[PDB]
Amino acid sequence: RHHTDVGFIMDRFVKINSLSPTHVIDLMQTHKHGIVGALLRAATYYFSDLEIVVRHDGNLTWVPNGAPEAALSNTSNPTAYNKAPFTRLALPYTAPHRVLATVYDGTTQLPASFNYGAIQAQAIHELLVRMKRAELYCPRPLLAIKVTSQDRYKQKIIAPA
Amino acid sequence: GIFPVACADGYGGLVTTDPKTADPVYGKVYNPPKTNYPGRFTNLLDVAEACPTFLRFDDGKPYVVTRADDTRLLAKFDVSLAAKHMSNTYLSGIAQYYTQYSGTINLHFMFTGSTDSKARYMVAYIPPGVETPPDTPEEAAHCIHAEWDTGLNSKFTFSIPYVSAADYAYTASDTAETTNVQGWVCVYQITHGKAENDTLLVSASAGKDFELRLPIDPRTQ
Amino acid sequence: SVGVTYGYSTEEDHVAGPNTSGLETRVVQAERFFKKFLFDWTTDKPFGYLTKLELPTDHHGVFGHLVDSYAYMRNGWDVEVSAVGNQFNGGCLLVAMVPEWKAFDTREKYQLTLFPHQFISPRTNMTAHITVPYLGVNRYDQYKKHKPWTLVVMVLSPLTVSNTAAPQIKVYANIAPTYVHV
């Protein structure tokens, strides 16, 4: 047995659709079938460090959670300047709460706490995210692809010529 | 007093599998130790042991019709890794994100009629390619067969050895050949005692040997 | 019986702690049982018939008083489910302690048993017995704005009856907050 230790499966990237001059940083903007979210959703309580990679233009800027967004551009809180072509960082963790989660049944919009944060620049094109040392707690259900036709399944397979 | 520079001729790609690390900025913050918080798991395997599953049939109902009649054959269902018999299934659900695998699928059985009633049942393996489904539990016994009655017990578990061509196999299937991959392994029975109605349940689970190699996204993300 | 089945561990608990615990000590007399209605269950219901019960309701107990006292607390949870019948039936119902409940969907029906759980059948069992240890995103909780725990039972095997049984059957349970620190 030398897999299913998430510590190996959850150290890659995945895409994020949405972007903006000011954009939010959270897992729940994942995709709900991309393999990352496959396991990443599959549990209740998870925790990790953070790593990110950004392709952009201008001056990328970031801040921990719990701040006034109106107080970002000024005074140049921690940040570094611009350089092409690639850029790679890793953010530490700013818990308001001792563990992350997925959904919180209270009298179905997501809570406001779990917030890896937000970035801001003048031109933001490509985003990349990466988990670290994560751990999982209280696993949850899981599905496979749906079955329609008769026998077992059929799928094309690549072969040489 | 320069040290001799060795400029990299053509390496250093921003490629996925790299294990390189980074540098914090607003770093150096402690955290409370998160020992002692229950619900900790590290491997889909172990947690893929303690739980059974629930199969499916065209009745859309998991449980199996179980008639107290003079019929001799119960019913026939395939067992595979990508099959309608085993879709809504935790083993496979984990599996479909894998191409390599080696491990015995496991089973269970739960009974319905009152304890008083006597009964007999006979599990029966079949290889993939016998070209003929057996039509009697004795001549069916040739592949692999066993017993467990109403007597003294109600639960039971049984398995099928991880036969293949070589020590691995494809998870998904093909559109270039025809022959089934495993067979039609199902169970036989002897004279029913008495019942106005019965029911059988069956499951699956990973035991000692379930193994995988990986990964690729199959889906249309 | 089949015995006791714990949740993820079985051990004597921590009982005394800091300023919050020293302020929210293990009061004992806020503990007591009571029963609650579950559902009717006759030969009518087909498979997949789901039913839920959020926790916890109100109660005219001192426990009920403090759970209204509108402040930080913590708790434990022992549940013991049972029902009465007779030996001329058949089938199985499914029971499960529920972490982080959400509205389910059809296909996932076949999945109900990741959680701690037990079977239900007239032959094998006549009394469930399960317990869940505390947890929560905070160190403690305040109910009115959340519920981290409910308890579920649902149809698993079709029920059968002959001319020698009670064509109506009821089912009860046992709610028991335990190990409480207010």
Residue numbers in the entry:
A (entry chain 1): 27 to 133, 155 to 208
B (entry chain 3): 1 to 221
C (entry chain 2): 29 to 210
Quote the study on this structure.
Foot-and-mouth disease virus (FMDV) is a highly contagious virus responsible for causing serious livestock disease. The virus forms an icosahedral capsid from 60 copies each of the viral proteins, VP0, VP1 and VP3, organised in the form of twelve pentamers. In the acidic environment of the endocytic compartments the virus particle dissociates into pentamers, releasing the RNA into the cell to produce viral progeny.
These ‘inside-out’ particles were characterised at a resolution of 5.2 Å, using cryo-electron microscopy (cryo-EM). Analysis of the unusual assemblies revealed them to be slightly expanded compared to native FMDV capsids (312 Å in diameter compared to 297 Å). Convincing initial rigid-body fitting, assuming that the shell represented an expanded particle with collapsed 5-folds, was possible only when the whole pentamer of the native virus was turned upside down and VP4 removed. The final model comprises residues 27–208 of VP1, 29–210 of VP2 and 1–221 of VP3. The interactions at the pentamer interfaces in the inside-out particle derived by analysis of the EM density at the protein interface of VP2-VP3, showed that the pentamer-pentamer interactions are weak and have fewer hydrogen bonds and salt bridges than observed in the native capsid. The BC loop of VP3 (residues 68–73) and the adjacent EF loop (residues 135–136) interact with a strand of VP2 composed of residues 62–68 and the CD loop (residues VP2 85–88) respectively, of the opposing pentamer to stabilise the assembly. Thus correct re-assembly of pentamers is hindered by the absence of both VP4 and the N-terminus of VP1 and the accompanying minor structural changes that have occurred in VP2 and in particular the rotation of VP3, which would introduce steric clashes with the opposing VP2 in the native particle structure.
